[PDB]
Amino acid sequence: TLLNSFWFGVGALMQQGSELMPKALSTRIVGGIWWFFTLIIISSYTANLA
Amino acid sequence: AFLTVERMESPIDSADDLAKQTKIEYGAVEDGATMTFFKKSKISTYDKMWA
Ligand SMILES: C=C(C)[C@H]1CN[C@H](C(=O)O)[C@H]1CC(=O)O
Numbered sequence: 001t002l003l004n005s006f007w008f009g010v011g012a013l014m015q016q017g018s019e020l021m022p023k024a025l026s027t028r029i030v031g032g033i034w035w036f037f038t039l040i041i042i043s044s045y046t047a048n049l050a
Numbered sequence: 051a052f053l054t055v056e057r058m059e060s061p062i063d064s065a066d067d068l069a070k071q072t073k074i075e076y077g078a079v080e081d082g083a084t085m086t087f088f089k090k091s092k093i094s095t096y097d098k099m100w101a
Binding site: 044047048 | 053054
């Protein structure tokens with residue numbers, strides 16, 4: 001849903017995996033490139049936080 | 051280490067950093083009070099800069 005899609009994006013932003021890991025390869029690429037986005041945003045945050 | 055480590059500073063920072071590093075070339079003006087200053091001073095660096 002539009003609620004469950006925004007709970008994927010907030011969930012994968014906070015490193016805490018959600019209950020609705022996508023099937024259907026077209027959505028695994030969206031979920032896979034949002035995992036690499038939030039990997040770089042957090043690891044640039046916590047490396048500049050010192 | 052690739053976000054905040056340092057700025058790439060100049061190899062020279064003062065008068066004595068020119069007195070050692072012979073890679074960076076000196077310079078002054080002919081008929082000047084700067085050239086006359088190194089010609090007539092002797093305090094441990096400014097003769098070496100005029101050497
Ligand atoms: C441009 C020149 C040669 C002049 C200008 N005033 C200084 C002077 O009149 O002694 C000199 C600068 C220098 O000595 O580096």
